[PDB]
Design a protein around this ligand. Structure first.
Ligand SMILES: NC(=O)c1ccc[n+]([C@@H]2O[C@H](COP(=O)([O-])OP(=O)(O)OC[C@H]3O[C@@H](n4cnc5c(N)ncnc54)[C@H](O)[C@@H]3O)[C@@H](O)[C@H]2O)c1
Ligand SMILES: NC(=O)c1ccc[n+]([C@@H]2O[C@H](COP(=O)([O-])OP(=O)(O)OC[C@H]3O[C@@H](n4cnc5c(N)ncnc54)[C@H](O)[C@@H]3O)[C@@H](O)[C@H]2O)c1
Lengths: 542, 542
């Protein structure tokens, strides 16, 4: 038992607070991981570092590096330390990037097996994970937008069905509950439900399908929001819930559907599945695809009854198409129905973390927001909700979606609050990679762009390079094999005037490049936002 | 006729010399382009900007931007201007990057057609092309290493056969001549040979195959180096040169073999080929692949006779394999035979350009080198050769391969020479993208890496991010569809102490990350270089 835990308090182990914050962020990733003794954070096998040896050497370099040197990380392995300057980043990471033609599913698996790459996830290998809370606002925003679009602004009395209680999926049953819906989440692995049940993200774990149906219908009939977990395989349980007439209003899914990493064929356990992939991969893929076709056909069968059925960024439709269900490619997605209007204004999963470990530092910022943004603002209705439902996990932190100009504004107020004692230690500002100007993903975030530019990955590359040029504390470029590319970045509010400058340079360009990206594709709200903030360039013949 | 030409002299059109140098570099790209009225620089269709409108807006932004702002370029289109700081780059470019699964040959063509991407080449869309001279030292180094490995250190009396007299290929007949060999270059387009003939890169253009054979044999019999061009299709001419018993010692090829961009089927002209691709692409590909199979089989037939036959980074083997010649995949390449030992020590196509336009500024640096590096050094034997054979093209410039620590050393001496009047204006230092630590290309530069890491593209991403963090003047990330990713960078020696700092920060990490990349793969010379310069990190369990 390594049992990594982020350091608490205000005593440096590093030569300076930039380094110590990143070290604590690294430790905090592991502390909140789904399988932390394997470095696994989430998405079945996305890791904080390539192995425990690289983890140890990363920790040593953080502790002794100077404020004008920069650590270089190649797929979870520290490979260099360069003398740079004080306004440059302290860490540069590039994880899981493989040239497209050889980044197919099968070869990524082989390269990872041989130790040549890691699967970075989004926030796993760049140390920006804050547990299940980093996901919950986005998923709650989706359920609320769905209630606004299709159910008259209310999920009271409505049924939400979904699967996946993993590191990201586990945020589902709380978001549904916060949204007013009776929410049923299927997971094949009881430990996953047990982890959400104990963390405050699941209300009860049902003992059977019948039991699950009675408890959801009671919530539905009382028109109360609540969460009900079921232990079972989504293929088998989805079909039984249709035979028993659950009649769900909303069906979605956040399973790991990767046959190589996490999708459990019907009849197997998670353990058996992972062993069949190590010893007989071709049978596993045959069994996985067999189970996914039933899984997808069951979701399509709920749609035929009138449920709103969408994908939630896990490649279910495409992988389902590959397994013989071409109708699965005609299902919609959470992005095109709910999130893209937010991205057009640069609104994304902005988050922050108290290196202190003191919950009073988060509550402090919570008061800043309520004194700083107008009532009715998206963020003024989220903070009371987060305060109410969301337990801290590891270093106290907060998810707070904000748009262009608003991120730099809050970050400067927090940097001043640090500078004058209301906050006891530095605040790390970061985000998910799935932000307006930092990801190209044709299966998810950039599906069906107005101008057809789905697969253009120039944008995240520019996002990273801007973050470096602006002085972010840590900058990362990831890939999901041949399907997606994205940029992440961390900027530290430590109280210094140097921090204040970086925070406003970094954050305004972070969202500014997102506004530009969507304006370029033709979205009119983004084009107006770009015109208003001077974000454009005059090009003739237009 | 736009007829772009780089500005000469020492009068600013921009607000500062960082901006004016980049503008002149942009203009210089076009001035030296193979088809400059279409923005085409080289590689059939790689362009300086997406269209003439973006070109004009890029020029306007350069002229009015401040020394603490940064211009952002997305596939040849200016998309943003951000307030950054004085130690950040002035331009960030990301050109031709498309997410892997959709960056296949056919879809890249469609995306370019619809105006959504550009093919950046290496130095075309990031404004680091210095004409055919940027290629000649590398190709001469290959011919000389081949003479050292297989022909006793001499090509006197030896025959070199090859094809492609394009922007890059045109460097071949001069490199062969400089190397002592009788060099025959086939190109299907007489204007290409005429351009090399007039620029000093081709000695004579033959009137027929017979004529070509007589003149090469005369050079061979006099054991003199010389260049002979032939107008014809490589498939037809290679076969005839075998029927007539040319018996070449060395066979290589630098054709554009892309059926979509530049490869001419046998019986067609360049014009007809490009029209058949616009109006009937499926017949063009059938005819191209038919011609390439004969082209490759003819090269293989020279090998069966005992010629040394290698590929030169144009994908001939892979595309030949796709067209039905699987033996073409067993041919070697210039990288694995000649260049990789240089890359292990960070030795790469370092180059520099006089924004002055005054040849006396290049000759000045030429004297610095001869006063600074030991006799017998690679660079002390190249400068007299370059002085002797290489005419200036556009802004006077110089190719000068140098290794780790040597690039920053020369760059600081030039920055001082600028600071004290021996050089009349700033010097722009750059390189090809095909450098040790800045490209992942499994078909070429990273084929058959000792550890199997051919397709790892983390490295160029890190190279770019380092250049930004270190304050390079311009930083670029390109892709060749799904086959390659690479980084470029420009750093300006303008005489300032700020320039001196950036030059040493940028160049040492530029090569330092290249040493690391090859040390990581296991190359012992690179591992020693890394140990010597403190470039590593201690990792346990090793
Ligand atoms: N913002 C977003 O776009 C977003 C949000 C949430 C989740 N996701 C996607 O969801 C996927 C998983 O993320 P994660 O971190 O939760 O992974 P995880 O590995 O932590 O959880 C995977 C879960 O699926 C479960 N499960 C697997 N196969 C099953 C099957 N046949 N039937 C029922 N349950 C099964 C596993 O037991 C496991 O608990 C990812 O692909 C992620 O990208 C995306
Ligand atoms: N350092 C390196 O690795 C290196 C060096 C030189 C060239 N190259 C490769 O060589 C390719 C071309 O580069 P370029 O800039 O010279 O392109 P280019 O478009 O300027 O020239 C292409 C040439 O091939 C000729 N040609 C085309 N088809 C032919 C055919 N069937 N028969 C005979 N001749 C034919 C065209 O007429 C044209 O002159 C590129 O793919 C480049 O990557 C690589």
């Amino acid at each position: 038992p390594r049992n990594i835990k982020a350091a608490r308090g205000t005593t440096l182990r590093c030569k300076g607070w930039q380094q110590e914050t990143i070290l604590r962020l690294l430790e905090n990733n592991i502390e909140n991981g789904e399988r932390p003794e394997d470095l696994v954070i989430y998405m079945n096998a996305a890791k904080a570092a390539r192995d425990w040896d690289c983890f140890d050497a990363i920790v040593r370099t953080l502790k002794t590096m100077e404020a004008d040197e920069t650590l270089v990380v190649q797929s979870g392995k520290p490979v260099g330390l360069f003398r740079t300057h004080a306004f440059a980043p302290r860490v540069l990471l590039a994880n899981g990037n493989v040239a497209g033609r050889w980044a197919g599913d099968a070869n990524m698996f082989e390269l990872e097996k041989r130790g040549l790459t890691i699967l970075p996830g989004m926030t796993a290998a760049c140390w920006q994970y804050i547990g299940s809370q980093g996901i919950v606002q986005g998923t709650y925003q989706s359920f609320v937008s769905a209630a606004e679009q299709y159910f008259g602004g209310s999920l009271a009395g409505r049924i939400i069905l979904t699967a996946g209680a993993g590191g990201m999926g586990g945020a589902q049953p709380l978001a549904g509950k916060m949204a007013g819906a009776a929410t049923l989440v299927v997971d094949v692995d009881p430990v996953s439900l047990e982890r959400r049940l104990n963390t405050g993200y699941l209300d009860v774990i049902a003992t059977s399908v019948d039991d699950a149906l009675a408890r959801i219908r009671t919530l539905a009939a009382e028109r109360e929001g609540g969460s009900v977990g079921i232990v079972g395989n989504a293929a088998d349980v989805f079909e039984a819930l249709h035979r028993k007439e659950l009649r769900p209003d909303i069906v979605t899914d956040q399973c790991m559907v990767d046959p190589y990493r996490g999708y459990v064929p019907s009849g197997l356990s998670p353990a058996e599945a992972a062993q069949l992939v190590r010893t007989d991969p071709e049978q596993a893929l045959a069994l996985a695809a067999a189970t996914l076709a039933r899984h997808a056909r069951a979701m399509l069968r709920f749609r035929d009854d009138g449920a709103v059925v969408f994908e939630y960024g896990n490649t279910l439709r495409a992988r389902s198409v590959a397994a013989g269900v071409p109708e699965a490619g005609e299902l919609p997605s959470f992005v095109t129905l709910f999130i893209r209007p937010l991205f057009c204004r640069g609104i994304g999963p902005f988050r922050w973390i108290a290196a202190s470990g003191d919950p009073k530092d988060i509550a402090a910022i919570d008061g800043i927001i309520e004194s700083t943004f107008a009532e009715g603002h998206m963020i003024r209705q989220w903070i009371p909700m987060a305060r109410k439902y969301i337990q801290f996990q590891g270093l106290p932190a907060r998810i707070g979606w904000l748009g262009h100009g608003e991120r730099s504004k809050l970050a400067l107020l927090v940097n001043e609050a640090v500078a004058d004692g209301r906050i006891s230690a530095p605040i790390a500002f970061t985000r998910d990679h799935l932000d307006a100007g930092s990801v190209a993903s044709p299966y998810a975030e950039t599906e069906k762009m107005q101008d057809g530019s789905d697969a253009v990955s120039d944008w995240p590359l520019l996002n990273a390079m801007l973050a470096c040029s602006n002085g972010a504390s840590l900058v990362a470029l990831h890939s999901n094999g041949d399907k997606s590319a994205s940029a992440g970045q961390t900027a530290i509010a430590d109280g210094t005037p140097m921090a204040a400058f970086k925070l406003k340079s970094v954050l305004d360009a972070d969202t500014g490049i997102g506004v530009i990206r969507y304006a370029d594709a033709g979205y009119e709200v983004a084009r107006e936002t770009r015109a208003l903030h001077g974000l454009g360039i005059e090009i003739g013949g237009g």
